[PDB]
Design a protein around this ligand. Structure first.
Ligand SMILES: [Ca+2]
Ligand SMILES: [Ca+2]
Ligand SMILES: [Ca+2]
Ligand SMILES: [Ca+2]
Length: 279
């Protein structure tokens, strides 16, 4: 399948080169795989989710997405226009309030919710979680991402937008989960992108067009938008039976566009997410 005039990120994860704008993908498109978007929530009712999105959990008065952050990450995962896995099921888990922030105890409770909630969902192709959130190191938050991963969910986490080593951030610093750095359309490390030995992969991060609240669209930049690209890819690759929840991050890194990114700190992997799809 070929989506002409796609966002630059989708086009890049189906490309050996930068500078193309056609997303190529197997028409299976992650069907029968679930991606949990742990975030501000999702506006499930966006015409771009075609009813494949629903809120399954909140730790606030409303499960709505008043923020947009989580509606925009869900979108990069499995929206029809701006998604990687255009047929995946999206489960919104609102750990972040509409200001975009949350307590670490609530985020932990959300990760543990998914590790269990998956046993209440039809995900025959497997389960993915996209954590586009982060803060300082916390062995407690790391251990929650570890558990979620260990429960048989491919965990993709932002490195963090601090332009520092991700070793000092959670759940970015957790060795067992997929830590995603950000790249821009010219294959440069996004100026904001965290780096280090803990990083496993890069996704498109800078100027990422996706879904927004009010049934709208807008472009926003972060490791937070790299993550849903990787999250999406893992969903896609799992539905193709090309990898599993446990070994997805490794598989993505084995099959990645190597050496293609500039301004990658020595000792950080030079690996851009690649679907490796041949039309
Ligand atoms: Ca674009
Ligand atoms: Ca987000
Ligand atoms: Ca976002
Ligand atoms: Ca987002």
């Amino acid at each position: 399948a070929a989506q002409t005039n796609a966002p630059w990120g989708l086009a890049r994860i189906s490309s050996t080169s930068p500078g193309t704008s056609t997303y190529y993908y197997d028409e299976s498109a992650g069907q029968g795989s679930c991606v949990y978007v742990i975030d501000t929530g999702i506006e499930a009712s966006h015409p771009e989710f075609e009813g494949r999105a629903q809120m399954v959990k909140t730790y606030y008065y409303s499960s709505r997405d008043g923020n947009g952050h989580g509606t925009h990450c869900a979108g990069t995962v499995g929206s029809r226009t701006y998604g990687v896995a255009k047929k995946t099921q999206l489960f919104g888990v609102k750990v972040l309030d509409d200001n975009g922030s949350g307590q670490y105890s609530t985020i932990i409770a959300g990760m543990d919710f998914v590790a269990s909630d998956k046993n209440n969902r039809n995900c025959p192709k497997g389960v993915v979680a996209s954590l586009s959130l982060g803060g300082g190191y916390s062995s407690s938050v790391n251990s929650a991402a570890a558990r979620l991963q260990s429960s048989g969910v491919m965990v993709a986490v932002a490195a963090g937008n601090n332009n520092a080593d991700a070793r000092n951030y959670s759940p970015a610093s957790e060795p067992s989960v997929c830590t995603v750095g950000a790249s821009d359309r010219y294959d440069r490390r996004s100026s904001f992108s965290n780096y280090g030995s803990v990083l496993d992969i890069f996704g498109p991060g800078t100027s990422i067009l996706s879904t927004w609240i009010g049934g709208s669209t807008r472009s926003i930049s972060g490791t937070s938008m790299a993550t849903p690209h990787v999250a999406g890819l893992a969903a896609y690759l799992m539905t193709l039976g090309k990898t599993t929840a446990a070994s997805a991050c490794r598989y993505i890194a084995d099959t990645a566009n190597k050496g293609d990114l500039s301004n990658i700190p020595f000792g950080t992997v030079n690996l851009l997410a690649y679907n490796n799809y041949q039309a």
